[PDB]
């Protein structure tokens, strides 16, 4: 598979990490 660059972090892969919730988005 050829992954794409999206310049954001999904909150689905973000658990126990607070910096995620500081900077996370979704579809």
């Amino acid at each position, epitope marked *: 598979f050829h992954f794409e*660059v*999206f310049n954001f972090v*999904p909150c*689905s*892969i973000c658990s126990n*990490n607070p*910096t995620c919730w500081a*900077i996370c988005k979704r579809i």
Partner: antibody
Amino acid sequence: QVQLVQSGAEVKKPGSSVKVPCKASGGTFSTYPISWVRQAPGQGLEWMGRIIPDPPMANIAQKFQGRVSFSADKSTTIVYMELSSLRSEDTAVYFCAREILQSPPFAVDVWGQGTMVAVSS
Amino acid sequence: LTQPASVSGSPGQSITISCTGSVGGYSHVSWYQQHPGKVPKLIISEVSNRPSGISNRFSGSKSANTASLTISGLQPEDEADYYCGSYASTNILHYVFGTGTKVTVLS
């Protein structure tokens, strides 16, 4: 358990492209993101970007953007990083490591062998 | 993250490496040791948490935006290139690594 396998050093011609591989021996490449760190022989570690298995999303730094492509063969779970439009500055050793973004580690614990990429000239 | 270029020490004493920041709760800073010709190894995590299998001579401290790695009982086997790394709370959550500190036991 989880150990990362990288290929041997590869000398490349200026302007070409190298696709350094990363294999998960004992790993599944389906939960924890796999970060790629670039290091010249004598350099400070420099994070290039990351690829995340749960969602097929790849994050790449702007400096490395435009040339780095995070491909991956789903079968046998082998991820490949291809640095396109090679130049003399690109000469460095490239490491793939398991980034523990989630979970307490909050660091890159398992590193790979490290494939040295040199632009011959 | 910026580190002292080199930190020299006599065998048995305790050296400290600073990691000054220009961010992830300022508790995500970790410490890495890279011996010449080998891959980097995680030595200290979560400011001071020590991964299993690491010697007790390594500790971690956090002041303001400066993280400190203190090696007690400095031995000639301890010397390596030490890097501190933490997330940068950016759009893609950059994991920023430190400049590097070459600890040297020399006396």
